[PDB]
Amino acid sequence: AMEDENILRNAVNLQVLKFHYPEIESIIDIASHVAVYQFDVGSQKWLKTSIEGTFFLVKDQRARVGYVILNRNSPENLYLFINHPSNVHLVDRYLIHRTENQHVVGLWMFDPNDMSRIFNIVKESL
């Protein structure tokens, strides 16, 4: 029954992800809830963006590893690629991802185990 629920869970999850981004191929891992933040350089302060949702560590049909947050507060989802694992940092209780074009996004994962597991997957995936 536990494995049956996981089969139906990943099926509906993958179909919804492909509904928004057909390039997505599979789901590497999932975090239950993630709040996204953005660090404003020049202002030197963290900005709390209202992107709160489920976290989907996915891989597209071109072997690019990325993550998708299904924002619960608005239809504006967040799909960001991880081109090299040296752009994600485990700092304090948060992950700090420096996107390729000098953007700093801060992911707070509600489950600390999801934080460590997602962080360790990215560090091993490349």
Binding site: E5, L8, R9, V12, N13, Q15, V16, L17, F19, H20, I30, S32, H33, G53, T54, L70, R72, S74, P75, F110, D111
Partner: protein, 223 residues
Amino acid sequence: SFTNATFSQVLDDLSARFILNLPAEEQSSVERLCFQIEQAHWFYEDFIRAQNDQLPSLGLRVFSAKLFAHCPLLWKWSKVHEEAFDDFLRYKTRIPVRGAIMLDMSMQQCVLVKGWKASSGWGFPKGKIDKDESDVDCAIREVYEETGFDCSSRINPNEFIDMTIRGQNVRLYIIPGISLDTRFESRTRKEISKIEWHNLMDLPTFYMVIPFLAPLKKWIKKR
């Protein structure tokens, strides 16, 4: 973008977005699932039914029934959905509600809020308590939520009015000295349409405020 998406694809999204990937701490009960159904309903009504006008506006009870008959995890409750939903709002109408009766510096006017739909009446800024948060932190969270004003440096935990309307426990903290020039605006997606001051003498000794008028007047005459 749901700009053109079938009602089934919508229910598929709302499943993966609010129900199927919840933390296990609140996926154990049935009522806890229905609270995320209410979150998925507000998403469908406000956002999904705004990119595809063809989708119908559904009541919370009707929307829950469609989604329970759709998501495979919820198939067990689909037959007894009317009774399980009855247990849900039976659960919700018992959650403690905390707020604040903000009086002005003359203690002759108070702050009231009006619900979104024009039929909804007036009432004090109050809201249901969240998991593990205290009564005072709840009153601060919801007064800031519904009026945009921070009353953490002004709330007096020893000065409140405790009421038990029906099965819903309501506690409103009395916060005098709120200046009339202070700015108010709600920080929610709906729920609050207007925020104004009201003369306490102009209140009926429509409003859900009457129960608190007897203790409040005795509290003001003391000061």
